Design an enzyme around this catalytic site. Structure first.
Site, PDB file in Angstrom:
ATOM      1  N   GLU A   1       0.822  -1.208   0.000  1.00 34.17           N
ATOM      2  CA  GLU A   1       0.000   0.000   0.000  1.00 34.17           C
ATOM      3  C   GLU A   1       0.859   1.261   0.000  1.00 34.17           C
ATOM      4  OE1 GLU A   1      -3.084   0.379  -0.437  1.00 34.17           O
ATOM      5  OE2 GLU A   1      -3.952  -1.623  -0.142  1.00 34.17           O
TER       6      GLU A   1
ATOM      7  N   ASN B   1      -7.809   9.318  -5.412  1.00 37.01           N
ATOM      8  CA  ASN B   1      -8.633   8.447  -6.234  1.00 37.01           C
ATOM      9  C   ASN B   1      -9.475   9.270  -7.199  1.00 37.01           C
ATOM     10  OD1 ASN B   1      -8.990   6.992  -3.106  1.00 37.01           O
ATOM     11  ND2 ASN B   1      -7.785   6.030  -4.732  1.00 37.01           N
TER      12      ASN B   1
ATOM     13  N   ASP C   1     -12.555   9.250  -7.774  1.00 36.43           N
ATOM     14  CA  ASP C   1     -13.778   9.798  -7.200  1.00 36.43           C
ATOM     15  C   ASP C   1     -13.526  11.051  -6.369  1.00 36.43           C
ATOM     16  OD1 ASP C   1     -12.584   8.780  -4.893  1.00 36.43           O
ATOM     17  OD2 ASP C   1     -14.362   7.713  -4.218  1.00 36.43           O
TER      18      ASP C   1
ATOM     19  N   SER D   1     -11.830  11.123  -3.510  1.00 35.41           N
ATOM     20  CA  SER D   1     -11.337  10.746  -2.199  1.00 35.41           C
ATOM     21  C   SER D   1      -9.818  10.572  -2.253  1.00 35.41           C
ATOM     22  CB  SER D   1     -12.013   9.463  -1.716  1.00 35.41           C
ATOM     23  OG  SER D   1     -11.614   8.371  -2.544  1.00 35.41           O
TER      24      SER D   1
ATOM     25  N   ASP E   1      -6.458   8.397  -0.223  1.00 28.54           N
ATOM     26  CA  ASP E   1      -5.972   7.365   0.689  1.00 28.54           C
ATOM     27  C   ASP E   1      -4.785   7.908   1.477  1.00 28.54           C
ATOM     28  OD1 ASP E   1      -7.842   5.676  -0.537  1.00 28.54           O
ATOM     29  OD2 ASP E   1      -6.320   4.599  -1.704  1.00 28.54           O
TER      30      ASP E   1
ATOM     31  N   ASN F   1      -9.010   5.369   3.290  1.00 30.64           N
ATOM     32  CA  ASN F   1      -9.676   6.233   2.328  1.00 30.64           C
ATOM     33  C   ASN F   1     -10.625   7.217   3.008  1.00 30.64           C
ATOM     34  OD1 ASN F   1     -12.305   6.518   0.389  1.00 30.64           O
ATOM     35  ND2 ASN F   1     -10.401   6.556  -0.776  1.00 30.64           N
TER      36      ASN F   1
ATOM     37  N   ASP G   1     -15.543  -4.619   9.299  1.00 34.07           N
ATOM     38  CA  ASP G   1     -16.724  -4.103   8.622  1.00 34.07           C
ATOM     39  C   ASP G   1     -17.429  -5.152   7.769  1.00 34.07           C
ATOM     40  OD1 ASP G   1     -18.443  -1.828   8.132  1.00 34.07           O
ATOM     41  OD2 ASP G   1     -17.542  -1.616   6.144  1.00 34.07           O
TER      42      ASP G   1
END
Length: 129
Positions: free
Chosen positions: A35, A46, A48, A50, A52, A59, A101
């Site tokens: 990562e 990203n 969209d 967002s 990270d 994120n 989650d």
């Protein structure tokens, strides 16, 4: 801060990630390597909009607030900048929520594509844990 491999393993172990939700320490070290290259200051944006953040590339759409991801949540109740500190405590606490989650470590694309199914314990070989 750029962690060494065993240095990160030891910090992660101290913070309770070894076998957390059934994921052995090597999984977390492997995810961190791919990562962020073990760099706490890693950021990646990203498409969209967002972003990270940090050593586990958490994120901003769901997990932290950076003031620029409209309509996003803040489920770890932290500024995303807190995930960039040399002290990994905030990243670890938030990652524990993520892995709980429902989807496990599959929420980390690099883990699913590069760590899942491999011999992850190699990432902690030679370390004094």
């Amino acid at each position: 801060k750029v962690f060494g491999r065993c240095e990160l393993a030891a910090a992660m172990k101290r913070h309770g990630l070894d076998n957390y939700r059934g994921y052995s320490l090597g999984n977390w070290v492997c995810a961190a390597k791919f990562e962020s290259n073990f760099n706490t200051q890693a950021t990646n944006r990203n498409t969209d909009g967002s972003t990270d953040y940090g050593i586990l590339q958490i994120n901003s759409r769901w997990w932290c607030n950076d003031g620029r991801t409209p309509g996003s949540r803040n489920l770890c109740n932290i500024p995303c900048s807190a995930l960039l500190s040399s002290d990994i405590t905030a990243s670890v606490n938030c990652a524990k929520k993520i892995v709980s989650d429902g989807n496990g470590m599959n929420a980390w694309v690099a883990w699913r594509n590069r760590c899942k199914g491999t011999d992850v314990q190699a990432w902690i070989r030679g370390c004094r844990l």
